[model samples]
Target chain A: DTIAAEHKQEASVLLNLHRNKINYLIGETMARMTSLSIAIDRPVDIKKMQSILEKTFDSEPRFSGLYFLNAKGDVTASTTELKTKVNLADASFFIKAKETKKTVISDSYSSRITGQPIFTICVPVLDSKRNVTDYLVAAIQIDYLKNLINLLSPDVYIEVVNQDGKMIFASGQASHAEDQKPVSGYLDDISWNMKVYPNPVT
Target chain B: KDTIAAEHKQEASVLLNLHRNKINYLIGETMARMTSLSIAIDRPVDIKKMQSILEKTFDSEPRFSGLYFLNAKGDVTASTTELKTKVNLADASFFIKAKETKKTVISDSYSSRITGQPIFTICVPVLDSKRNVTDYLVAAIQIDYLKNLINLLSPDVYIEVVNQDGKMIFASGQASHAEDQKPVSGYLDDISWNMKVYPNPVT
Candidate 1:
């Protein structure tokens, strides 16, 4: 019982630290992107914005791509080549960024642009009256977050849920799911919860 | 394996007891200071200065959420958070119990209306030179802050704090159920609080 309790406590603390790391990284990235977004006072030069986006992608390993979205949510510039300009007007990320007028992170979804499992951290460029003029979005590969979990405790099963208790990620051994109780940690800022269960005792 | 488990439990018990003692001493010291402050003040207290001092102290210390001064009639004279009007706190069990016993007391956990969070109250009674009760000094401690403190001591055996009613106040381990009554409770001397420690196991 002592060992079990100790492992649970350690897992809780470690997972919380991991969550903090992710939140901190997100904040750092948001600060840089928001600063750039604010610096561009008018309509962006696609070539110039794309160059900056590409440079940012090269600088950040976890970043899959960086996209500049017009007020209408049409892709104006991107780090990667686009076969055609995509309309993201209806996308939840775009809609949420406009609605909240704040830095928003999307729940796990298959990116309409990438057609791959991914998530985005988005910041809005606002006018003097606080109307969103454009959105600066960074698309991050889901695998980057999964890799974090994998590094922490590869032997343990893990499940991550967003604020609404919706499962966004799950990985590791399925057999361990039955016997071990899931240890949960909440990231209040991001409204995400992560649960980790140790491997079943043989 | 049995020996190792026994040693782990023993170590956890010792550490938990020390933490309980420290918490009890904090409660005692805080109440004593409040009592002394109350005695030093004149009958017609400077409500504005007292409120200002309370706000400054509460903001500086994360351990306490708010502070209040209740007059002789059990009316809240001043509070860290503004009240619509002077609240008659005579009905609150913390105030009633402290007034009845004529001693500093700690209340069980309850949802705070002011912060809308789980909190517990520690109250010290104010008295005149003739030993007549004059007022009450109360401080609110948020449970979330206490939970953070418990989490800071993680990586050891799991620890849970509960009230006299057995409601879990904080749990350090993830799998521990907060709804269940904690077993193996150790009373915090003179304070209505309990600390419980549980051993983590492989299965």
Candidate 2:
């Protein structure tokens, strides 16, 4: 193969590396929240659970809010002192996660907490008998991930698309812009795909 | 023979880099876990409470063999392991480096004193008011967990991870590598460890 063709293949490998990084970040968050899932297992007090959520909320900058909800998705305790009672029963992914016993992540949504776009990572909490008891929800702010992409691959122009396609994230490494084909890869657990280009004409 | 060897080398190179990605991200994730605990406990110097919380957190995290807390001078203040004669890292290089740098420091793989499992400690410094160093937090990760993880991810490839000193740490897969077939190798991030991948050379 030509040297330029070799470079394209190399670019694809780098693309996969960065894509796996997105997976790891999501998985790590799952692992982090698993601690809280286990926390309420022994004997959960709603007020005491508030303390737990608040402590984790303060340290977890990635999350806009951390919520502990019952199996029905009623926000039993929250990181925020509520202005109104909240229920996510209509959030059907909550039910899906429980039924499948798998973590659920969604593209950006107009958050019920902030009324701004936020990513959701929801995990089901199962009892020792393997019955689903509750779900822990992580409302992730997009800016954290945008900045993370900038930090990881500053020279590359990357866009994470669910549909808008304008979710462009980049740093000022403009010299890397090339006219060649852009590399694209999909996220392992979500519907999103991250498209990266060595050069975007912009 | 050389053409076959070249093709094998090329295939193994891509696999090695992909495996390297997983290893790097996982180590980064584990390090993040240690730092979060370090920050969470800036609110605590409580010995028994610390022990209880530490054990609780340890139960869900299979990556770690044991977790611990040490005083400013490296005394075994609180830990998941039962401290019989007071385990302290007063002179341990990783603890000193964490205290000195006021940052997360990682140690080489060594057999654990408490559990006798091959593990490495990821130490994050604890600083108090005015940001003076007050204590240390640790996550001694079980190396065998990484071995198992890698094997699950790539069941057919022969994978071997070695430390900076070039000593074999562990190898995971159904078989070992052959000398004449050669292997593709690369270093993992956040530590001076290398993971080598080789084709099993059997149908």
Candidate 3:
């Protein structure tokens, strides 16, 4: 019981750290977008936008790519190797950013390019009339999410599940249905929940 | 009661982890500094430089009760606190462990014979080129420093640091007395010490 209690406490602390780290990264991206919105005009200086996006990506390993989407959800500029133009009108991140007119973190999905689980953290690029003219989106690789799950002690098992009850990550023992009452916590921004239980004694 | 239990568990965890982190950082820093000084000193041991280092460390950290250089036989050769002048610690377990391990060792809390205050000892070996132990560099860390750490935590819960033998090293709470109290214990990360906390005043 003591061991179980310790793991529960550790999970709380670890989850709090994860939340803060993601929030900090999102805030940094939002600040950069806000600054550029004020400095440049619409259909923004494509050359300068590319330079700034590349510099931003270089500053943080969390950002896999940065993209700019017009109000109609057409990708205008990208920080990818080929700087490919694409349409993300079907994606929920661009839709949510346009509708909410605020910064938002998207649900996890497999990337078309890398085929790896990824999420987009984006902020609406606003104009002088306070209308969302475009979206500044950054793709975040889920590597750090896996890193956070791997932090559990050897004696316990942890499973991270999305809102749909799909297990996204697991570590330690194979969890059984009756493995005591699992300690759980929520990842509010991402709509995910984490459940942790002690490994049965051999 | 469930609400209270949750709050108590959180408070206990936060306080215990805070103490663990602070101690690890402070002890790591002190050990690195002492080891560096031990390596830098020339042979025949310059008494002036040793005293200077000890005095500087003692003055730098208010929580450091005393700092001393002891010969292999555990007789104090130099001290920052005059109270320990020429004191023979040959009989103490801290001295024996330092000699036996030839590495940094942290001792369980005990009353200082000179000052009569509760303190813990951290000792590292001063070695020769061949790794022969020439002397021990020991620092006395006051228990009050830990008590101060516990005090910084929330006042709603009772928190106590206890040794493996079930002796309380430091405790703070609203309860005027705690002999008959029961507590939920959380083990420290790298030490034999445990932090026990109670939700309310205990009889």
Candidate 4:
């Protein structure tokens, strides 16, 4: 029983650490992403910010790549070698960014263009009326995230999920379905647990 | 071995049903006792008292090692040990089952967030007078001893409780394998192994 108790204690600690890291990573990147997204009014500014991010922090674990999306959810700009050109026009994340009129993170997804692993860190660019003009999106690779997660502690699996509960990015040794495997939406089943869902930066 | 699996499954199911019923009753009772609890709080009845009560009850129970309480959002409200983390309650198996069933639930063993240590929970939901959910969930852990007792036969064992929405409210033993490491913030199915499900009215 003490063993079990100890196990529970250890498990809780590990889960909390990784969970906090993922949250902190998302929050910090969002803050930076938001500032850059908003500051770069023209395409030239986007290029400037990308260069700065790449030079200053691109090599850091969890600091993968940066990009921009047009109002049609097409990749208009990017710093990631993984996501050269892709259209996310019909994605739920695009809709979410449009609806919330703010920055949003999509679930783990592979880039159709790069054919390598990638996810979008996106903020809706609003017009003067506060309506979304376009999406400012960045490409985040799981390799960097996985490294950061390892720093927090080993034996932990971390992943990014959408409201529908699909893995957009994940890391660790646990077996996973094939990359980009078609999985169902997550929200279909709601349990009684009071869990914290990601709040959009509207 | 067959007898044990059948019996374990039966007991798990029974316990799940009772947990759901008790949560409904306990929530109502707690509301009625809220004034008393407030008085109790004023009298210096702190969270420690709740811990003491839990210790006296489940901690000493055979094969019962630890327990936890989660708010409706899957955040750990309280735990048996001084955990290094505030694990998201949503990732635990039992809570998901309870939320899906709008009742009590249980879960099988899976890796937990703190480390690779196996973890599981027995969950019950708290409801108000209008049958509306208040803060919900009580998760209990089943140690290896109980698992050994039941799994003398099969290598593949599953014990789960799905709500009306086909989402698990409680699951235990090896059944919770896929759910252990998934994102704590995403929906339950994002980490689930099965597919067929029912949509939840209350999330």
Per-residue alpha-carbon lDDT of candidate 4 for residues A109-184, written as tens digits (9 for 90 to 100): 6666655675666778776578776676665676666666566544433354656655545545443222212112
The sequence of per-residue lDDT tens digits that candidate 2 reaches over residues A1-202 is 3555555656676677677866886878776676566434345677766776786677667777888888878899888668888988787677678778878887777778788677778888887788888888888877777777788777676667765564534443545755666787778777677776654333
* Model 3: CA > 4 A from native: A1-12, A15-202, B1-4, B83-85, B176-182, B200-203
lDDT of 3: 0.68
Which ranges in model 2 have alpha carbons more than 4 Å from their true place? A1-15, A33-89, A93-104, A112-117, A123-137, A141-188, A191-202, B1-6, B154-156, B173-176, B199-203
lDDT of 2 by residue, B61-165 (tens): 787888888888788777887767877777877877888888888888888877889988888887776888888878888988888888887777788899888
Rank candidates by TM-score, best first. 2, 3, 1, 4
**Docking category for candidate 4?**
incorrect
Q: Model 1's CAPRI class?
A: incorrect
lDDT of 3 at A19: 46
Please say which candidate is ahead in lDDT: 2 or 4: 2
Which pairs, if any, clash in model 3? none
- List lDDT for all candidates, in order: 0.71, 0.74, 0.68, 0.47
Write down the C-alpha DockQ for each prediction: 0.01, 0.21, 0.02, 0.01
Question: On residues B104-154, what C-alpha lDDT tens digit does candidate 4 reach at each position?
Answer: 554555555543455454455655446644444354444354335334432
Query: Model 3: DockQ against the native?
Result: 0.02
> Which candidate model has the greater lDDT, 3 or 4?
3
